Subunit: 145 residues, 8 copies
Amino acid sequence: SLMNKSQQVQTITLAAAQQMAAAVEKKATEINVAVVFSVVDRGGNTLLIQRMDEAFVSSCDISLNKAWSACSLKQGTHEITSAVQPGQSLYGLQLTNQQRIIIFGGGLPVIFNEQVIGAVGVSGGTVEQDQLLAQCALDCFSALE
Amino acid sequence: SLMNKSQQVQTITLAAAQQMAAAVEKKATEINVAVVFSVVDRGGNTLLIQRMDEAFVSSCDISLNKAWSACSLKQGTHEITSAVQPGQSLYGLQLTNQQRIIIFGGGLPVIFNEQVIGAVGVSGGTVEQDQLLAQCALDCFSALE
Amino acid sequence: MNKSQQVQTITLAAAQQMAAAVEKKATEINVAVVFSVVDRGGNTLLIQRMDEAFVSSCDISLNKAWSACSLKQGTHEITSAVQPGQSLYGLQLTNQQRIIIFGGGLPVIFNEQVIGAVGVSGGTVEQDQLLAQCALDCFSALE
Amino acid sequence: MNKSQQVQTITLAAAQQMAAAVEKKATEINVAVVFSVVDRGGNTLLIQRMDEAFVSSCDISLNKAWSACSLKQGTHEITSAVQPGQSLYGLQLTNQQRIIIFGGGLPVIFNEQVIGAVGVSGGTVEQDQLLAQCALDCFSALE
Amino acid sequence: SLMNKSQQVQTITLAAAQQMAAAVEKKATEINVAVVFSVVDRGGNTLLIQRMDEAFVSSCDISLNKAWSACSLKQGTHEITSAVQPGQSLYGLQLTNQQRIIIFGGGLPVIFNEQVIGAVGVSGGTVEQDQLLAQCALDCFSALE
Amino acid sequence: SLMNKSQQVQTITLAAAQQMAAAVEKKATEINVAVVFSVVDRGGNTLLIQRMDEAFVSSCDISLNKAWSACSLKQGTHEITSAVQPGQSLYGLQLTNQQRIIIFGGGLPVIFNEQVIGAVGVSGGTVEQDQLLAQCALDCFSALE
Amino acid sequence: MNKSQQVQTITLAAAQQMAAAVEKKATEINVAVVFSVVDRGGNTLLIQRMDEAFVSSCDISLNKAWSACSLKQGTHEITSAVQPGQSLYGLQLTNQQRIIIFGGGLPVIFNEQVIGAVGVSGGTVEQDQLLAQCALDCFSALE
Amino acid sequence: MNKSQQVQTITLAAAQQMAAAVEKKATEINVAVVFSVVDRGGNTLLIQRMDEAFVSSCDISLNKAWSACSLKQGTHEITSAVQPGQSLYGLQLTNQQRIIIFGGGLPVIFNEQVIGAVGVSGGTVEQDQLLAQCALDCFSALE
């Protein structure tokens, strides 16, 4: 055959990041919560981090790493929780990668054209809230343009 | 809707922290334990760390990071202990933020005007003792004017 | 005695205004940058990277903002202090190297306080600085 | 609004070829090196260390690749800018000391995009930069 | 008793590691997973890291540190999993050594002459899959001469 | 009263460290095990680290930190194991101090004149062995001079 | 054989006095500083940060104390040795960048033993070293 | 092909001989030092501090030994390579700053191999180096 020497991939943009920030900020407001929102591009690289003024300062690292975890492992941070419990197959996964791997909900990959173009991360509510606001961002994304 | 380019907040003062340290060093003597005692401002930055001679040296870093957690999480460090055991919804949190979120008792926020203005951390006793002494610091603070 | 000081901090709303402003100048002067704002106590409010800004510019942008808030001054005003043979040689090595020692970070002075700071990284130093200043200029004509 | 740009990244297969060109060419010049290729986000594809290479050159080589990618230019380019007295003195300390300021790191520039990068360490800076250009020349000769 | 100022040991060679990587990349394809594959020498220093395009990027650091653990512990990384669960005699070990001791399967030592000469690490599949592939690397090595 | 402005304390020496190294090395040999041995002085500061040639390279950090843990917390590393289990008071202690706190046996404080003058640490056997060789060092110490 | 030496360490009580002498003297000269005292092993006794001090000076101040203790001499002493071209160029990078090379850190020398140390940061290096000597003078006036 | 290289490593027994030797000279030239040995692959065999050696000398001593093993050369032979303006300026910042760039670390060459290394820190550079060499000299008249 011919070798593929380079491949074509889609990355999410700041434009799109910026818009999902506003969705999240508007949804978080009416469920009466202050969160950090993060979006990473397709390589896991920080595009946006945005912290509501009443949100936990502890939640900026968390929110970023949920995005990076969601993009890197290609799934929600909620989907790895069961695998990392004492006694489960991937127990100790949470200790790798300088502890960047987040293992509770709040981080989602962004899927465009059967492909992971980036990810989002929300922190500073309950875990159920984080994840609801994370899907909320995705639902904004898919609507755009 | 007129929009706010700034926010007026309140922070605890070094001289408040110094009074707090007097009261802890006293009460630690009366119950016969040596501890390390820490105060952080509104942004979790250090105001005051004090180690009694006989307090473990491993308690320096813990005392400070108890103060930091209770600030950033705006709750007592004992309050999160339940949430982060295996199987629970925030298991893994103790590994975030370069392991500065301490998950056992002895950190408490200074609440003034319904608002987190600062925090204290006591390390070196039992968990029960650390939490008692740290309460003692807040009892003092609300007795100053 | 006083058990608490009143102080002032920049908001997310402010930082968002300033970001749109910085993205707008950066586009016209043909340069892709990272823009970061921190609050009063030096903590992260808003970080943004344009799609073409160097991925190593994320780290620096935030740290510029942090240093300008920390040191109550612009990160360009320290560059000379720190050279070999000079009194604060080595200050770049403290604080997990989070002290940035070239221009592009600037405080938000408001009300004769330091209420937070901005940091810009991406293009030349002077481009960063100009784009940083247009962030502040924006801030002043918010009400 | 554009919610996603198309971009382009080097493959593992391409990095394996560059590695085999560098490996031969290092030995013909009588040096042992470490070769590292990063993709578009500067994420690792490959690290390959010759037996007699310095184990110190592993992290150096990877960070040469990451640097070149993220800065979009050669680690050899930034060397004059970071010298004491210059404008970017203190860049070297940023990003957890990953920004390597001496020659050896080169971006892979296919379609006017940095699509990734390579880094060689283990020799002189001159030999390092020779080997890395020698890998880029492997790539642009591939199909 | 004459005393030894040096010791003759054996180490695995880069060209051995390159053959091993060929065989893993092959067998990963045939079972349909993308992984990252790592080899370390007699002292746990890196010989070869290889990430297939689609393998998680969080597996780079894991693959390498599996190779490192199985070298330094002179056993399979699956072999310590039992010992380090809560309540067990080496709980806490996973936190040592800057979190480089990986406590789930996929690291295996190259034993030659009854002697640890090197190690391999596979990360990116299930734990079962990683351990299969890493075995595959050793099967290959002992078939070379 | 008069303030004590400085206090008098005893520190262990290299001399003594060196001698307990030989005891340990001789005992480890006849129970057929290769270990790392460490001794810290009274401030927790490294006096000696000594690695048998067949011992796990993973065991140098461990062995040092067992000593530093034994000196810092003023007790054996075996005595904190029960306190740090999930659900126990000091759960998460193992995450503090850059993870230097070791929580399985093998580290002992050295007690001279009702005072902790330093500590020892052994690693690279079973935990029971480490601790047996650690007491073995103490038993050598008390015999000296 | 001697299995244990007697040594000697500063107390918390003594560090509290030095802290209160520095705190007054900083304000009389119109600067805000961070004061830190380490014991004989360079283990922390005290960190006390004036409200208007740079939060960057916390880690600087502690590491001034630790440095002085461990090196047994003033951080001001080693400054000439670590300059580029000199014999100890690259000391500054050792020990996780804890070895601070500019003035502010002084050992407490009671009975010809370093028994611990102090560090001040927040001013000029000149003011820093003034304040720290000013703390040693508090100690040697105590009983 | 070859699937494995035979190599040679220093033993604990050797390192113990050399330590007694280094402690013996250090005592006569009136200086307290830390002495460290690493093995073939650069890993810790023996570290020893004399009761008066600066506590910051532990870190450096080991790292000297590590660099001399890593770079297959003495840590004094690199000092000139790394100055500002010179080709390996910055090499002191790689490898978590474990590259020591002043004298006092030296390899154990045995049998035209590098079989490990020593490192000495504590006194002047030249004292460290001399004491380092007397470690090697010791090693050569072991049998």
